[PDB]
Ligand binder design. Structure first.
Ligand code: HDD
Ligand code: HDD
Ligand SMILES: *[C@@H]1O[C@H](CO[C@@H]2O[C@H](CO)[C@@H](O)[C@H](O)[C@H]2NC(C)=O)[C@@H](O)[C@H](O)[C@H]1NC(C)=O
Ligand SMILES: *[C@@H]1O[C@H](CO)[C@@H](O)[C@H](O)[C@H]1NC(C)=O
Ligand SMILES: *[C@@H]1O[C@H](CO)[C@@H](O)[C@H](O)[C@H]1NC(C)=O
Ligand SMILES: *[C@@H]1O[C@H](CO)[C@@H](O)[C@H](O)[C@H]1NC(C)=O
Ligand SMILES: *[C@@H]1O[C@H](CO)[C@@H](O)[C@H](O)[C@H]1NC(C)=O
Ligand SMILES: *[C@@H]1O[C@H](CO)[C@@H](O)[C@H](O)[C@H]1NC(C)=O
Ligand SMILES: *[C@@H]1O[C@H](CO)[C@@H](O)[C@H](O)[C@H]1NC(C)=O
Ligand SMILES: [Ca+2]
Ligand SMILES: [Ca+2]
Ligand SMILES: [Ca+2]
Ligand SMILES: [Ca+2]
Ligand SMILES: [Ca+2]
Ligand SMILES: [Ca+2]
Ligand SMILES: [Ca+2]
Ligand SMILES: [O]
Ligand SMILES: [O]
Lengths: 688, 688, 229
């Protein structure tokens, strides 16, 4: 924090000043008499309002909705026989980082829990330059050439005439594009499985997507896939829960991250690479240059390089998070590109687009973008030039500055260099590689590898989405494409949307799998930051007292208990009015609160004699319990709190429903078991 | 449409071209061989991606989230004895209009149904210049001096460190500001009543807020308040239903307006003025220069001037709606300003801020900002200069261009003029007028004038919001200020939030009222665009058939029937999966569908033997009915469909619950009666 | 078609002091007087196989092709005949690009040309302050525009197609792809190839920096040699 603290403005106990250090007041405009017109000579007014009028900058063209944190990387080894990268040069070597997570399609201010691909962008402030791995939470992307990006994004984003719908693929154009461009199918399945609706940014993995090169000082290369393996564990929602979260808390995932860091529950990921040889580009049966293809870990294991920990929130979101400007072109000696046509064109885009955002060329001079390494070059001027170059002779080769700055390359000065054995051959052409043409086998691989419930979640997502596609031509074209993945998938979706069941096409059908590829099916590794909503009553103080007791039994695993009651009495954390099932990973009815959960509570007429509360909507306590159950959450009840389960027609005989005598260790153990499972999949119907 | 049509690009059945008219292809980057690197000389790639990279412009600093429509104004009179404004010069005189509706705090992707003040910005493209009345759906504003705008907005918008929470006042800073700056209280009560959460942009009124001057050709003035009196009727949600809508359809109100216009259901408002004398500024017990004060209609009635109808959607949202740049400084001869310090400073802000949005000075040259009147002046150059001035001598006074362009003033050329009897007097000063100091009497007026349910809505909003305020000091400060409005209001709110019940402070208490000031309590004037969701089943074809029958009996009042079923069969409009109570103004169970509404349906275990549907979440049909009921909506059932009411513990004896033998006229009449009432207020508990 | 004419240095200096606008004024006045200056467009036509045969590299922008080796074939004539109405709007804002290319012309691997292509698209963002510089009157084409590019500050058009992507069915597959065989599309000369290791190097074919300067020097009348000295 040494570096960024030089730019901090501390406004504790100080007098107000203009931006040029003149002390001022700023609460009344200068007027001609008490009730007079405002004077033009009021510079205090105009400077204040001019700053205000110009606060905004263009949102990012994609990934506009996102959230950042500072952290650190630790290398596990001296990787010099693999890469010349300085940040990987020794066991225990540490490098600062900044990471931003995001959705893709929605604008600023859109819901965190929209269904989408998620950005997972990681900057290493290395001692040999900034290195960015600008990744996502899904290892494959929709399209195979960067020139198609505007097509994909215009189709996914809102209609051009009326700008509907926000942050959603559930409209004709998106599905038109997906069916017209079947390369999209692999990412589409990932996003419509649990990966499109994660519980938090701490409960996803990251991926660089593209094949990159690692290169040693002597020019030897390997091809790699970059991975960020999360140490908390994958966790995802079901769609109806993600929708409800969008309505109750648009900031749900950004808030989770912020709070977890404030609580000292620092999320971690291991940096890994699947290490391959130059000769492996086509040998696996798909092209390593094709960003729609994964390398299954059965074919190439993930070699772990080191660990990222996120551990400090920004001081000012705009200055740090909004203004961070990631680029795949932020590359360092020891890494190089490949001819993946999607990567190739990204390189252009991310340098250009910062001109839009920053409004000029000196965006690398913003504190969050600056390197932690010296800058010496002949670049000059531009709007917003914050440095003062001492060299008046800004050219090479010079004698007037004694030949400095000096050229750095592979042999001197630790320069960047292109892997020296890379070659080009062939006619200059605008063509789609024939090696890129199997759009369906890997989608099928993914589909085969999912637990039954998560197959169902894909079907139900596609049914929801395509039922909102007005065009019969598009609906039919979607089914025809899905059928090339799996006749089962296609048939199951078709039945909701008025499309004839398709005949099988066996061209790409196969039964191979890859392990643990879905969002569902594994227990969490860490329970840190999960929440238990304890539904209590101010009329039974002992019910509220159970919060602290339960908390003592859950603190050692980083789980918080939130006491919910009718009003803010002592030791109450939230009111029923302010609460919703989507706030809580588990919901527990406290002993003595059961009287709030009557089955008639949704519809009883709130006459003056009725006893109906004005402190919350009719039925709210029972709505929270029922929504928690239906969404698949851990549900519990203490003592006579179990009567509330009976009112809700929830049997403790069901999986993920727990009762206990009191809030001690025995019950906490069972709630921990529930939270580790995270979602109880037997509450979802599956096609037969 | 003739004017804007000159800028249309029709892309039906044509070849792709670059932006300089060279035919192109745009689907494959140019590569060095089939699997080669992308070439720099690929200008097609770069022009496409550069346009993409630079698509975004800064969102509006406030009112970022909004929706536009074209329309027309028709004057009802020759108003020349009141104002010289040309658009008001004759009975029948038509002027084109563009109107944008918005929230205030949220960024451009935030939910339509956030609770907020709403913008209501109307441009008249008059034959003597663009005239903009940049208003809101609430007649009073939070603050009394424009210099305070960054304070108000920084407090309401997300926290500076983490940018939480989106589009919400339910956080410490906002309530800190409201309690520290009690001028805020009038608008706060309006926004926490129904006016904060309207059903649609068609179901609100508009207000200019400030007092303005109307001025005749001979310099005579009146003071006025501008009104837009809606002809559909006020209609608003309850908080829980606004939240649910945010989660299910972030575009709900934008969609409503687009659809209503495409249906020919054109919304209308009458422009009106409260006409006052110069000598009335301090006569009524408050200052007409104070924008936190209404003029009750009992004191000065609204004189109706003419009518706005909105009747055409944009062709391209970005080009038209996103780029429209309103300004109160877009004033015409016949109107003038007052010394309201809020208005005074607005004039500076809206000219300045377009520089940010447009990135240069020529924003009035965008098609949507152009006038429909001649432009002739000596302004020159600037980035993005779209015109070519023929006069090379761009100064006055000139002889080299024969004294042209010629000065226009009161007596020649129909120039703008400041009302000539306006004066200034007094010492130059930065002070708050003593006439502005009663922050509490008018909030009490507003409070007194509400039906009991809407008082409860204000209480319940403030309890929800302030329960989210962490600071005890802030909570107490809020209660102190509320208590100066009404001890009842303050006491009712305090009891939810752990603040001691305040003792009365009666300085500003009174019993006066003003009529029909809330959002609740009157029947709707028109039912256009309201929706009845008919919950049917594909397994009972006759249930689906009731849709068309009911539709026939409701078409004449502009109400649509939407048939909901399990899957998209013939005559089904939506699936259950895709549906929610919040989509429908009334919900009706079709005869034959009752089997879907079992009371065990939320929690039944969906095993192979259970017959649980995979086509929708467990309990969805009953959830839609129960939500509709709890939210206050018209609910009904046809035939045996009434069994579903029983399952949901909904009695037909309750108000706004209707049973019918069949889908004929009698039942249609009951549904129209329910829609007219709109919300059944007896379903909400009230304090005692 | 007027003829080469030049100053001596001391005369050019004196002109800078007396009339900074001397050449701009000459052009403006000549056009106002109806004395329209003309140039003939010509090409030295060579074969693909001629890149190195002349003893210097055709990709090297420091080398001329002497007209003794390859004559100038005259294609047509330019006449300049109308001054701007507003200098800022027309002259200051004109934004030239070598990337403004049409079917029937293509690039070569001259490393100076290659990078120019990037620069002239980028730099207009600085000048115009946004992406829609081709919409300025002086930059607009006299030919239809139909594409899926959208938005950006200063968007002067209103696209009617709400489905701005390919491939689409929602707009019936339009705008349609144009290439060598359909729609008169631009196309890269199809026999061009690449070969070799990716590298940052100076071609050895570019290394004679002095023979052509000497050719030029030898070809001057004595006075003009003196003027160089
Ligand atoms: C050629 C266009 C293009 C293509 C094909 C991609 N992107 Fe992209 N992306 C951009 C063009 C772009 C951009 C327009 O340049 C953005 C918007 C803001 C920015 O700085 O770059 C960006 C932002 C952006 C961000 C947000 C960084 C942040 O948090 O500020 C992430 C995580 C990604 N992208 C990730 C990817 C992934 C993993 C891709 C495929 C493997 C991908 N993008 C393809
Ligand atoms: C001195 C600052 C200031 C103050 C006190 C206000 N405004 Fe404002 N307003 C702006 C500064 C501003 C702005 C920053 O200039 C905006 C942002 C975008 C724009 O064009 O103007 C704007 C936008 C804006 C819009 C959106 C117009 C559109 O749809 O594009 C509306 C409807 C209003 N304002 C309405 C009001 C009302 C009724 C006010 C009080 C009576 C008010 N504003 C006070
Ligand atoms: C409005 O404009 C006219 C401008 O008329 C000029 O006035 C001066 C003094 O009479 C005279 O020297 C010019 O020749 C006049 N005519 C023109 C075309 O310039 C003023 O005369 C009015 O007084 C102005 N003021 C008002 C209140 O309209
Ligand atoms: C690199 O390889 C050589 C030969 O295998 C070996 O001696 C050395 O230990 C390796 N270096 C590192 C840092 O592991
Ligand atoms: C690298 O640069 C050095 C120093 O400028 C230069 O002399 C050397 O020849 C270069 N080597 C390579 C690999 O180009
Ligand atoms: C699995 O993949 C291998 C790898 O190509 C392939 O040869 C084999 O046929 C596949 N087996 C199944 C069950 O699809
Ligand atoms: C305006 O006023 C005069 C006098 O009252 C009268 O002659 C005339 O009717 C009025 N004109 C209009 C436009 O109403
Ligand atoms: C209330 O209204 C009455 C009108 O009968 C008026 O005389 C009085 O001044 C008003 N009082 C307040 C406090 O607003
Ligand atoms: C040119 O495009 C046409 C029409 O899209 C396409 O069908 C044809 O195959 C293309 N030919 C070439 C040369 O790529
Ligand atoms: Ca290719
Ligand atoms: Ca159990
Ligand atoms: Ca004042
Ligand atoms: Ca619900
Ligand atoms: Ca009834
Ligand atoms: Ca700019
Ligand atoms: Ca070279
Ligand atoms: O992206
Ligand atoms: O505003």
């Amino acid at each position: 924090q040494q570096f960024l603290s030089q730019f901090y403005l501390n406004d504790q106990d100080v007098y107000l000043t203009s931006n040029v250090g003149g002390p001022i007041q700023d609460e009344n405009s200068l007027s001609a008499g008490q009730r007079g017109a405002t004077l033009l000579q009021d510079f205090i007014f105009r400077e204040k309002i001019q700053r205000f009028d110009h606060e905004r900058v263009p949102e990012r063209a994609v990934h506009a909705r996102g959230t950042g944190a500072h952290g650190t990387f630790t290398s596990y080894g001296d990787w010099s026989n693999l890469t010349a990268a300085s940040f990987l040069s020794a066991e225990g070597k540490e490098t600062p980082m900044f990471t931003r997570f995001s959705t893709v399609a929605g604008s600023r201010g859109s819901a965190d829990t929209a269904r989408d691909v998620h950005g997972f962008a990681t900057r290493f402030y290395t001692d040999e330059g900034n290195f960015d791995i600008v990744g996502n939470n899904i290892p494959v992307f929709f399209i195979q050439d960067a020139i198609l990006f505007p097509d994909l994004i215009h189709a996914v984003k809102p209609r051009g005439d009326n700008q509907i719908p926000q942050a959603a693929t559930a409209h004709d154009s998106a599905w038109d594009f997906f069916s017209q461009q079947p390369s999209v199918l692999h990412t589409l399945l990932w996003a419509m499985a649990g990966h499109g609706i994660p519980r938090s940014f701490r409960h996803v993995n990251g991926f660089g997507v593209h094949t990159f090169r690692l290169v040693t000082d002597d020019g030897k290369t390997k091809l790699v896939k970059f991975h960020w393996k999360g140490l908390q564990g994958k966790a995802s929602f079901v769609w109806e829960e993600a929708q409800q979260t969008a309505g109750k808390n648009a900031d749900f995932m950004r808030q989770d991250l912020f709070q977890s860091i404030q609580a000292g529950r620092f999320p971690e990921w291991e940096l890994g690479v699947q290490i391959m040889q130059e000769q492996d580009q086509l040998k696996f049966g798909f092209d390593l240059l094709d960003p729609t293809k994964i390398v299954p870990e059965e074919l190439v294991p993930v070699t772990i390089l080191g660990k990222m920990q996120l551990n400090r929130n920004p001081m000012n979101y705009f200055a740090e998070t909004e203004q961070v400007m990631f680029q795949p072109g932020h590359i360092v000696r020891g890494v190089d590109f490949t001819e993946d046509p999607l990567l190739q064109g990204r390189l252009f885009s991310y340098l250009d687009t910062q001109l839009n955002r920053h409004g000029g060329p000196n965006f690398e001079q913003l504190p969050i973008n600056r390197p932690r390494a010296p800058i010496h070059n002949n670049n000059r001027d531009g709007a917003g030039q914050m440095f003062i170059p001492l060299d008046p002779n800004a050219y090479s080769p010079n004698t007037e500055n004694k030949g400095s700055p000096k050229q750095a390359n592979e042999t001197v000065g630790k320069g960047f260099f292109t892997a020296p054995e890379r070659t080009a051959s062939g006619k200059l052409q605008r063509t789609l590689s024939t090696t890129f043409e199997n759009n369906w086998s890997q989608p099928r691989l993914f589909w085969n590898s999912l637990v039954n419930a998560q197959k169902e979640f894909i079907v139900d997502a596609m049914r929801f989405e395509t039922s909102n596609v007005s065009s019969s031509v598009v609906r039919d074209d979607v089914i025809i494409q899905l059928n090339r993945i799996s006749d089962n998938l296609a048939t199951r979706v078709a039945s909701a949307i008025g499309v004839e069941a398709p005949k099988p096409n066996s061209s790409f059908y196969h039964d191979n799998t890859t392990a643990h590829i879905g969002a569902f099916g594994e227990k969490l590794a860490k329970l840190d930051g999960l929440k238990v909503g304890l539904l209590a009553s101010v009329n039974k103080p002992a019910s509220i007292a159970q919060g602290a007791k339960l908390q003592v039994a859950l603190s050692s695993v980083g789980v918080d208990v939130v006491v919910v009651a009718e009003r803010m009495a002592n030791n109450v954390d939230e009111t029923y009015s302010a609460s919703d099932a989507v706030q809580f990973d588990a919901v527990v009815v406290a002993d003595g609160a059961e009287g709030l959960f009557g089955a008639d509570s949704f519809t009883v007429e709130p006459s003056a004699g009725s006893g109906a509360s004005t402190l919350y909507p009719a039925g709210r306590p029972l709505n929270i319990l029922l929504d928690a159950f239906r969404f698949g959450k851990t549900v519990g009840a203490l003592g006579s709190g179990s009567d509330a389960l009976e009112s809700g027609q929830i049997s403790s005989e069901r999986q993920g429903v727990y009762t206990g005598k009191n809030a001690g260790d025995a019950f906490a153990k069972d709630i921990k078991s529930g939270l580790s499972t995270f979602k109880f999949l037997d509450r979802f119907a599956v096609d037969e």
